[PDB]
Structure 1
Amino acid sequence: AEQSLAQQPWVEKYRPKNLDEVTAQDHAVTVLKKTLKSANLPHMLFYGPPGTGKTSTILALTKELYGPDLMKSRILELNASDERGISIVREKVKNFARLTVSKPSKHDLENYPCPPYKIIILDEADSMTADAQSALRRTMETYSGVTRFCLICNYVTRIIDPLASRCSKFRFKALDASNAIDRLRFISEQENVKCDDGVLERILDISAGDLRRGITLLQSASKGAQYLGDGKNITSTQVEELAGVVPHDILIEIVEKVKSGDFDEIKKYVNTFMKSGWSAASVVNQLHEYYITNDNFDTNFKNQISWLLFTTDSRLNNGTNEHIQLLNLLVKISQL
């Protein structure tokens, strides 16, 4: 129990258990909490960037609705490991939806408000085929009195159009250093991490639109600090060194090579840079940040460099070779 929750990473150690610990999306948790007193829970469709709280808030809503006793008998969960095909979604999901709700015990009925319906959660619905989602339509429509569906996804476009109308949409906003710093402060205080004044802001800015990455980053930084045993604080450089963030000096060197240089010099420096392990996505992001936030260039350069960086990012997002794409980006940005 407590020793079990102690023996797991900070991601699972501080996973919110109720609707009050999820301090990121006040627009959706309000409806989910108002649903408690009422009984008209519509078919939900949580969608948003990775690591935001969807899978962690649906479980909290379930725990608060039914309780630890009825939860294991009143919900079905199809996330990714089960075989979610047309035959399975036609047989098993339909059988569980067209099924009588279980009898709530006196303890559960007295403590938690038990609504007269079960819950089928299809986690990461963007991995299902089109025929499975098409079959889900009337299955979720006709048995709406004893079963409510909750879909979760990172891309709403992948879900077919009919399911985008049946379910009520809930967009989970990204987590920057503005509305998510409180949870990180609370975790750092609960773990006695000797953080600096503004290192949490840098941690949250590194994990653009994500919190779990920031949590594991803080955990790794605290572990590396405790290993040395010096007890000193952790600097922004200390956390950005292990976060994949490329140092600023070598970035300035890259920009200096771009500002003037032939094809051979840039190719040699790109090879030497790729000799070390640097994620091309982070390098592209930092180059974009440095070039856009600057004011020393002209608009006729800014528009072209923005388009080129966008094209390079779209190329890198398809899982291609980092070296070739980075070299092409640097050559094309030097051509201007």
Structure 2
Amino acid sequence: QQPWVEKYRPKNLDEVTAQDHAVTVLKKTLKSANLPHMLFYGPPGTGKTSTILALTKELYGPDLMKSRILELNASDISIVREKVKNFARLTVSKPSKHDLENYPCPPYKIIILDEADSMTADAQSALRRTMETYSGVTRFCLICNYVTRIIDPLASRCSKFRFKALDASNAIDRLRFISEQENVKCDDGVLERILDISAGDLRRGITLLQSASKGAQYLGDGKNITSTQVEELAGVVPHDILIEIVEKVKSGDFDEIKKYVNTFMKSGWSAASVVNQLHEYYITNDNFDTNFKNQISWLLFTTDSRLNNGTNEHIQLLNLLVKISQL
């Protein structure tokens, strides 16, 4: 059919919730009839892409927009530079009578570079040069998460828009509305569990909800979503297994920890998820003193760094558990 992320995207600017300041500034700029280079930044899944798409749809119109809007991920510099140059150099098509009747179609095109913060300094300098070359007819909208990763020369050329993190109420209401519209039956705590797993990212939450709905449809039972299915889809280890791991670590016996790790590795659960869950459990616990947390932070950091390099999960997990047991 279609992913629910794009299907339920906000249509107009007024449909964006909990973004009063940025939305108001964007409406003021739209009324001014002068669109400068835009740099949207904020935590993921807050509507930056939705806000920019709504702004374009209110500028060119539903039909004309497809001709004046380009989207690129800015990942992996020659290729993206060539595509941007080709899109910008192309002559703007002629607006139709209906487009001009109700939309004040500006005489320029918009290119949206998502994940702009992932670019390197040289790539950002090349992008700045391209912007300067084609500033007259092209307006850029760089979507990112951290504004500090953009080089100062490039950042100074764009008006900045900060997006605040969505509150739990707005996200839960949005998920509930989507579920009712799509006829999704979920047990109490399922939506909150999805939000917790997604860490407030509505994109990931909606994707997980769609996956859980598909799984329930496949199941053929009452189709009442349960937190266990959500965790299984998200790859989150069950909390009970984490509790047993913590108890074994507290025991301190090397042989028992080794046997438990050997048994666990047969389950197929990822070691990275276990490391993240252990970090969350230990860092946010009031039963451990300052020195214990000082040591556990470094131990977890070292284990995560070793895992990220493509190392054997079994050995790294066993070493981490042995180290924690010895603290």
* Residue ranges of structure 2 left out of the alignment (5+ in a row): none
Q: Aligned equivalents of 2:203 and 2:182: distance in 1? A: 16
Paired residues of 2:75 and 2:118 also in contact (CA < 8 A): no
Q: CA deviation at 1:300?
A: 2.5
89-98 or 190-199: bigger deviation:
89-98
Contact 1:23 1:183 in 2 (8 A): no
Aligned in 2, Cα 1:209/1:315: closer, same or farther, shift over 3 Å?
A: farther
Q: May I ask how many residue pairs the two structures share in their alignment? A: 327
Report the Cα distance in structure 2 between the residues aligned to 1:150 and 1:120, rounded to whole angstroms: 6
User: Which deviates more from structure 2 when the two are superposed, residues 229-238 or residues 86-95?
Assistant: 86-95
Cα distance in 2, alignment partners of residues 251 and 45 from structure 1: 41
Do 2:252 and 2:326's aligned partners in 1 also have CA atoms closer than 8 Å? no
2:218 is paired with a residue whose SS is: helix
Distance verdict in 2 for CA 1:105–1:325, change over 3 Å: same
Contact 1:89-1:135 within 8 A present in 2 as well? no
Following superposition, the deviation at residue 274 of structure 1 comes to 1.9
Q: How far has the Cα of 1:271 moved from its partner?
A: 2.6
CA change 1:79–1:234 in 2 (3 A) is closer
Instruction: Determine which of 44, 48, 57 is the counterpart of 1:50.
Output: 44
Q: 1:137 offset after TM fit, Å?
A: 2.2
Render the CA deviation track for 1:13-69: whole Å, top value 9, x for unaligned: 223333244435444333223332222322112234554433333222212211133
Does 235-244 or 56-65 show the bigger shift? 235-244
User: In the superposition, relative to structure 1, how do residues 76 and 223 fare at CA in structure 2: closer, same or farther (>3 Å)?
Assistant: closer
Shift of 1:100: 6.5
Q: Are the counterparts in 1 of residues 112 and 141 from structure 2 also a CA contact under 8 Å? A: yes
Query: Mean alpha-carbon deviation: is it higher for 283-292 or for 87-96?
Result: 87-96
Offset of 1:206 from its aligned partner?
1.0
- Greater displacement, 135-144 / 95-104: 95-104
Classify 1:89/1:240 alpha carbon distance in 2 versus 1 (closer, same or farther; 3 Å). Answer: closer
Query: 2 CA distance for matches of 1:206 and 1:260?
Result: 29
Instruction: In structure 1, list runs of 5 or more residues that go unmatched.
Output: 1-6
The answer on whether the counterparts of 2:113 and 2:142 sit within 8 Å (CA) in structure 1 is yes
Pair 1:203–1:94, CA change in 2 (3 A):
closer
Change (3 A) 1:94 1:289: closer
Give 2:66's aligned residue.
72
1:281 is paired with a residue whose SS is: helix
Contact 1:24/1:180 (8 A) holds in 2: no
**Which residue of 2 is the match for residue 24 of structure 1?**
18
CA distance in 2, matches of 1:334, 1:203: 32
Residues 176 and 210 of structure 1 are in contact (CA less than 8 Å); yes or no, is this contact kept in structure 2?
A: no
Cα separation, 2, equivalents of 1:50 and 1:254: 32
Shift of 1:272: 2.0
Contact 1:99-1:146 within 8 A present in 2 as well: no
Q: Distance in 1 between matches of 2:123 and 2:112?
A: 15
Cα-to-partner distance string for 1:154-185 (whole Å, 9 max, x where unaligned): 45455433212222333444456343112111
Distance 1:13 1:74, change over 3 A: closer
Task: Provide the secondary structure at the position in 1 that maps to 2:58.
Answer: helix
User: For residues 280-303 of structure 1, what are the alpha-carbon distances to aligned partners after superposition, in whole Å with 9 as ceiling and x for unaligned?
Assistant: 332222222322343333232233
3-state SS of paired residue (1:166): coil
In structure 1, C-alpha distance between the alignment counterparts of 2:239 and 2:82, rounded to whole Å: 57
Question: For the structure 1 residues 276 and 37, does the alpha-carbon distance in structure 2 shift closer, same or farther, using more than 3 Å as the test?
Answer: same
Q: State the match for 1:176 in structure 2.
A: 167
Once residues 318 and 144 of structure 1 are traced to their aligned partners in structure 2, the CA distance between those partners, rounded to angstroms, is: 41
* 8 A Cα contact 1:44 1:170, kept in partner: yes
Q: How far 1:186 sits from its partner (Å)?
A: 1.0
CA drift of 1:91 comes to 6.5
Q: Which residue of 2 aligns with 1:3?
A: none
Q: CA deviation at 1:211?
A: 1.9
Q: Answer with 322-331 or 206-215: which moved more.
A: 322-331
CA contact (8 A) 1:23 1:180 kept: no
CA gap 1:286/1:93 in 2 versus in 1, 3 angstroms:
closer
CA offset digits 1:300-320 (Å, max 9, x no partner): 223322343344344445554
The structure-2 alpha-carbon separation of the partners of 1:241 and 1:65, relative to structure 1 and needing over 3 Å to count, comes to same
Contact 1:74/1:119 (<8 A) preserved: yes
- Residues 172 and 290 of structure 1, relative CA distance in 2, 3 Å threshold: same
The answer to whether the Cα contact below 8 Å between 1:77 and 1:120 also exists between their aligned partners in 2 is yes
Shift, 1:225, TM fit: 2.9
Report the more deviating stretch, 18-27 or 58-67: 18-27
Per-residue deviation, residues 251-276 of structure 1 (Å, max 9, x unmatched)? 11101110122334323322321222
